[PDB]
């Protein structure tokens, strides 16, 4: 009677974002008040992300673009990340504004920028770039996060978030669990009456390592995860749909990095999006041991793209 869909995938694959799209596309959406609650999360993304940047500039021994920015880097590093509000990923507006000037200078520095280009060597979401490039609008006193801002804001998912919605008189329940290794121990609590599983993967994580242990390749982790889910007989009658998310990022990445340097099996033009997308797809099908497998190239932050992709997902699931 109910269509229960589980969103599975390693950390930072796009689950919480997809869930937000459902609310935007089929639910009540986010009114000004509800968007206003993301501001503390957004100012926290920015401050903490920049702190990681100056720290990487130092330890990676990358030189400043301008020495006078050493003072700004000092200001940021002095920010206590473990204080109560900061510990829960939130920063008041008044505090954010005190750091704005320094943050703006640090982001104009070529050293900090070079550090960003090498984020694969550490841990940093490209969503901090989206906000650093929009400091002007986050700065203004009466700033209210846009829909696009809300979608980009990054909040870890420790816990189980459930969202209920309807489409043409059909009740739907989507479940989002965390994807960090430590969070997965809870995945078993949500498998009762599951109709379909949407397996998300950041298609552009081939050059990165896990945040859990900074030594394991991200794609590799995804594949091993998919492997244990897709071959579990208990899910024999469950629809497994594969989402190769962050297509927009892969489109950028293939032009400066080559998947060839991380996965030998690759043969084709590493500078070509279509070639890398097929390799990724084959890699996940290759893990099956048998039931068909449908896949989709998505961009979770793109509302219009998720609108039509889900259209296919709904009809697929509804015809099983």
């Amino acid at each position: 009677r109910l269509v229960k869909i589980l969103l599975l995938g390693a950390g930072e694959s796009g689950k919480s974002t997809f869930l937000k799209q459902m609310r935007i596309i089929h639910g009540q959406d986010f009114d000004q008040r509800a968007r206003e609650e993301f501001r503390p999360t957004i100012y926290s993304n920015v401050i903490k992300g920049m702190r990681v940047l100056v720290d990487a500039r130092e330890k990676l021994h990358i030189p400043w673009g301008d020495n006078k920015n050493q003072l700004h880097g000092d200001k940021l590093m002095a920010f206590d990340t473990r204080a109560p509000m900061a510990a829960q990923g939130m920063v008041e507006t008044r505090v954010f504004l005190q750091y704005l000037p320094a943050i703006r200078a640090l982001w104009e520095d070529s050293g900090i920028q070079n550090a960003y280009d090498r984020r694969r060597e550490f841990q940093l979401g490209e969503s901090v770039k989206y906000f650093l490039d929009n400091l002007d609008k986050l700065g203004v006193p009466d700033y209210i996060p846009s829909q696009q801002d809300i979608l980009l804001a990054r909040r870890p998912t420790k816990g189980i978030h459930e969202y209920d919605f309807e489409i043409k008189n059909v009740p739907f329940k989507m479940v989002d669990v965390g994807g960090l290794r430590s969070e997965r121990k809870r995945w078993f609590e949500c498998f009762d009456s599951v109709t379909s599983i949407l397996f998300l993967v950041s298609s552009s994580e081939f050059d990165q390592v896990l945040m859990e242990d900074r030594q394991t390749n991200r794609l590799t982790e995804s594949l091993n995860i998919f492997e244990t889910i897709v071959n579990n007989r208990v899910f024999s009658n469950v629809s497994i749909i594969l989402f190769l998310n962050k297509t927009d990022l892969l489109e950028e990445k293939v032009q400066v990095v080559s998947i060839k340097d991380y996965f030998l099996e690759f043969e084709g033009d590493p500078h070509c999006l279509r070639d890398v997308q097929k390799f990724l797809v084959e890699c996940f099908r290759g893990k099956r041991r048998d039931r068909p497998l449908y896949h989709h190239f998505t961009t979770a932050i793109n509302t219009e793209n998720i609108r039509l992709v889900f259209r296919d997902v709904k009809d697929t699931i509804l015809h099983d």
């Binding site: 903490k48 990681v52 841990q123 982790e221 208990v234």
Partner: protein, 185 residues
Amino acid sequence: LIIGPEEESDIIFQDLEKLKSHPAYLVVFLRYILSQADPGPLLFYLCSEVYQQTNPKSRSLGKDIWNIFLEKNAPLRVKIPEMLQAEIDLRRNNEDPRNVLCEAQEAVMLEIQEQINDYRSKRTLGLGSLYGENDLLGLDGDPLRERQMAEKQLAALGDILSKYEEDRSAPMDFAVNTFMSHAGI
């Protein structure tokens, strides 16, 4: 180095001899096996273990082991060196097979190891709970208490068995209980 923006029982699970003595842990492993892999090897190993410890008299068991795991069209046929199979089959002469049946058990051990390494990898992915590992939380090195959780756990197997045809689910259930019973569950 370089700050982040956000930020045992392995001993029992990696060794088959200590996993056999811990029924609660074994049941979890049998769950993984029955769901993610070939049940043959392990199930053949356990029944053959009951034989090796069962007093010669034992015949019936050995007979069922042959039809379920070793003979031509066996439902859960396991793959062992042909020589060893012909010899086991001979001991027809109703003689002592334990000696050659133990070699069959060792031949299948490499496969059981791969699967052990396999599940440990899954535990690393933090997915141990997907196989009942969460039922091990409140346990302490005490025979009687642990083997109490063995039951209830052993009932959560029907959930995976039932999704197997009768000519396979039947022998499986037969195999599991044969060893569980010998372990006292």
